[PDB]
Amino acid sequence: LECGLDKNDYFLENMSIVMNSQDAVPFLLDPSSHMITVISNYYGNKTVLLSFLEEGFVKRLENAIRFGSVVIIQDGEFF
Amino acid sequence: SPILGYWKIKGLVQPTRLLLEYLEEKYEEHLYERDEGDKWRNKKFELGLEFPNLPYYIDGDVKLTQSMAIIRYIADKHNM
Amino acid sequence: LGGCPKERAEISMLEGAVLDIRYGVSRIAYSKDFETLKVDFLSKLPEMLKMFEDRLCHKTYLNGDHVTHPDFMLYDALDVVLYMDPMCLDAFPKLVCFKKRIEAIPQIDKYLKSSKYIAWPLQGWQATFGGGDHPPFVIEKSLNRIKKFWKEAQYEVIEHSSGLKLVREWDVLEQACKEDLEELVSMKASNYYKIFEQDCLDLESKLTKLSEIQVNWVEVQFYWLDLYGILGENLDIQNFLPLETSKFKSLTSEYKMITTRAFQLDTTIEVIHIPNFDTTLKLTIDSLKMIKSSLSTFLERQRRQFPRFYFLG
């Protein structure tokens, strides 16, 4: 909540679902990209933002995987 | 005549060459001179050796490069 | 050891050729340059591995169908060289086999997985290669690829009709710089980079300076080449613009010396070490913008006098 998650019971359950289980990659759908900042506040410096549309996507994620970066991919429709 | 390929130098053949000369056993050289880098690169490939290197010796079905493999061979062929 | 003098000497010949590889390790390991000597070792490694793939043709193990010592030698080497390269064997499948074969001996395999077995280092702590407490991390493998790339930097150089020689195909090095700079930024997220990290900060300062001069230089190259079409060639145009052409030619002298001085260095990275390069090019591009701006004022003041010229372009 401190990061800026909405008070709604629905949005609490949602964030629980996202975090608590990670044995699988979570897919976050939200029109208001307020959620892209929430995860950023949680991981801070470790947070590296990418997008399936940007050019250097292919290599930038490989850098992210090698040195433990927390990655969020901005355009999941295109994959 | 049985053949040792190497630089025109003592190089990696030197003790082996002596042993041979000790047993007065006959052989000849394929020597790459001081300004003769080409002569080596000319034979570098055609040596039929289990390891490429110089020197390489080839005589009585004894095909060798690698100073150890070579020297040991001559040595063993004489129980020495 | 073998069943006779012959099979015992065969096993020893394998011993020799195996030491020509176990020793090959130690010859490049003590050097302070080792990370750059590895390059020439790993290039030769193929030709060496091949010979073992052959030896394994029509044989079950090195030195015969009854398994002998050289197979356990090569297995130690392999164990060590797989750390240096994980892909060293993939190009020699018959050796990758011979290796798995040894490791397949039930007792051996059970041992490697046992608790008394030491997973790493390779050598005495003091050695450059395979020393210390803990196996790599990849941080090393990547930083070494970066340094390698920067001591191989090449610019297509092509002289045009007149004096000066031009740099073709900017983007490739320009891209590489960007990518390698971003790689060092992602290295900060890693836990294992802390004192290993200081070095990267030095390489970061070197490359951030190289992109600084990369940016200005492409601009000068473009803006000069454009303006050379316009003033460098004709008599009539330079007659109309006197202070402009006298001042273009003065910068043309400087940049001619700056290029030929920089190109003969023969290392693009070496370019950051040249005196006053960022300052030089920044000032040249500013002056090149003043000439393009002065032409722009002439053309529009020409156009305003006979409006038709507005139609022309």
Distance of CA B44 to the CA centre of its chain: 13
Bridge partners, B6 (sequence order): B31
Task: Report the SS3 class of residue A37.
Answer: helix
At C258, list the tokens.
Answer: 């700056």
**Is residue C311 in some structural domain?**
no
At C25, list the tokens.
Answer: 């390790």
Domain match, C233 and C127 both: no
Q: How many helices (H) and strands (E) does chain C have?
A: 12, 2
Domain match, C100 and C143 both: no
Which experimental technique did the depositors report for determining this structure? Answer: X-ray
Cα separations (Å) of C28 from B32, C33, C40, C125? 28, 8, 10, 16
Residue B78 has a CB neighbour count (10 Å cut-off) of 11
Residue C116, domain CATH: 1.20.1050.130
CB contact under 8 A, A48 and C179: no
Taking every pair of Cα atoms in chain C, the longest distance, rounded to a whole number of angstroms, is 108
Beta strands across the sheet bearing B56-58: B28-32, B3-7, B56-58, B63-65
Task: Report the SS3 class of residue C258.
Answer: helix
Which chain C residue has its CA at the smallest distance from A49's CA?
A: C186
Residue C254 has a CB neighbour count (10 Å cut-off) of 13
Domain match, C164 and C269 both: yes
Which domain-ending residue is among C137, C156, C181? C137
Is B44 among the annotated ligand-binding positions? yes
> Which stretches of chain A are DSSP H helices?
9-20, 35-43, 57-66
Compute the count of residue pairs across chains A and C with CB atoms less than 8 Å apart.
31
Domain match, C42 and C131 both: yes
DSSP state of C191: G
**Is residue C6 in some structural domain?**
yes
Resolution in A: 3.4
**Is residue C310 in some structural domain?**
no
Which residues contact residue C265 at a Cβ distance below 8 angstroms, ignoring those fewer than 6 apart?
C271, C274
Domain match, C215 and C290 both: yes
Number of domains forming the structure of chain C: 2
Domain match, C118 and C157 both: no
> Could you give the CA distance from residue C139 to residue C130 in angstroms, rounded to a whole number?
15
Length of chain A: 79
**Is residue C156 in some structural domain?**
yes
Among candidate residues C59, C72, C56, C61, the one with its CA nearest the CA of residue C108: C72
Beta strands in C205-295, from DSSP E residues, in sequence order: none
Which residues contact residue C292 at a Cβ distance below 8 angstroms, ignoring those fewer than 6 apart?
C223, C226, C227
Instruction: Check: CB of residue C70 under 8 Å from CB of residue C63.
Output: yes
Domain match, C214 and C230 both: yes
Cα separations (Å) of C111 from A62, C76, C105, C114? 35, 14, 10, 5
Task: Report the SS3 class of residue C202.
Answer: helix
Do the bridges between strand A47-50 and strand A70-73 make them parallel or antiparallel, or are there none, so unpaired?
parallel
Domain match, C128 and C143 both: no
Interface test with A, best of C138, C149, C186 (most A CBs within 10 A): C186
DSSP state of C164: P
Angle of the C196-227 helix axis to the C138-150 helix axis, nearest 10: 30
At C131, list the tokens.
Answer: 């020393």
- C194-199: list long-range contacts, CB under 8 Å, 24+ apart: C196/C139, C196/C140, C199/C143
* Helix/strand/coil (H/E/C) assignment for every residue in C104-133: HCHHHHHHHCCCCCCCCCCCCCCCCCCCCC
**Is residue C61 in some structural domain?**
yes
Instruction: Check: CB of residue C285 under 8 Å from CB of residue C216.
Output: yes
Instruction: Check: CB of residue C15 under 8 Å from CB of residue C70.
Output: yes
At C47, list the tokens.
Answer: 């030709």
Residue C246 has a CB neighbour count (10 Å cut-off) of 10
From chain C, the residues in CB contact with A71 under 8 A are none
> Could you give the CA distance from residue B39 to residue B6 in angstroms, rounded to a whole number?
10
Which domain-ending residue is among C137, C162, C195? C137
The range of the structural domain enclosing residue C75 comes to 1-137
**Is residue C44 in some structural domain?**
yes
**Is residue C179 in some structural domain?**
yes
Domain match, C175 and C37 both: no
Instruction: Check: CB of residue C114 under 8 Å from CB of residue C108.
Output: no
Domain match, C76 and C195 both: no
Domain match, C122 and C149 both: no
Instruction: Check: CB of residue A5 under 8 Å from CB of residue A15.
Output: yes
**Is residue C47 in some structural domain?**
yes
Which domain-ending residue is among C74, C106, C137? C137
> Could you give the CA distance from residue C123 to residue C106 in angstroms, rounded to a whole number?
26
Instruction: Closest CB to A64: pick one of C142, C186, C188.
Output: C186
Residues of C with CB under 8 A from a CB of B: 9, 12-13, 16-17, 20, 47, 51, 54
Domain match, C125 and C181 both: no
Instruction: Check: CB of residue A46 under 8 Å from CB of residue A68.
Output: yes
| Backbone φ and ψ of C168, nearest 5° | -90, 155
Residue C183, domain CATH: 1.20.140.100
> Could you give the CA distance from residue C254 to residue C249 in angstroms, rounded to a whole number?
9
- C93-96: list long-range contacts, CB under 8 Å, 24+ apart: C93/C53, C94/C52, C94/C53, C94/C56, C94/C57, C95/C49, C95/C52, C95/C53, C95/C56
> Could you give the CA distance from residue C149 to residue C39 in angstroms, rounded to a whole number?
12
**Residue corresponding to tokens 């049985």:** B2
**Gap from C13 CA to chain B (nearest CA, Å):** 6
Instruction: Check: CB of residue A67 under 8 Å from CB of residue C190.
Output: yes
Amino acid at C165: K
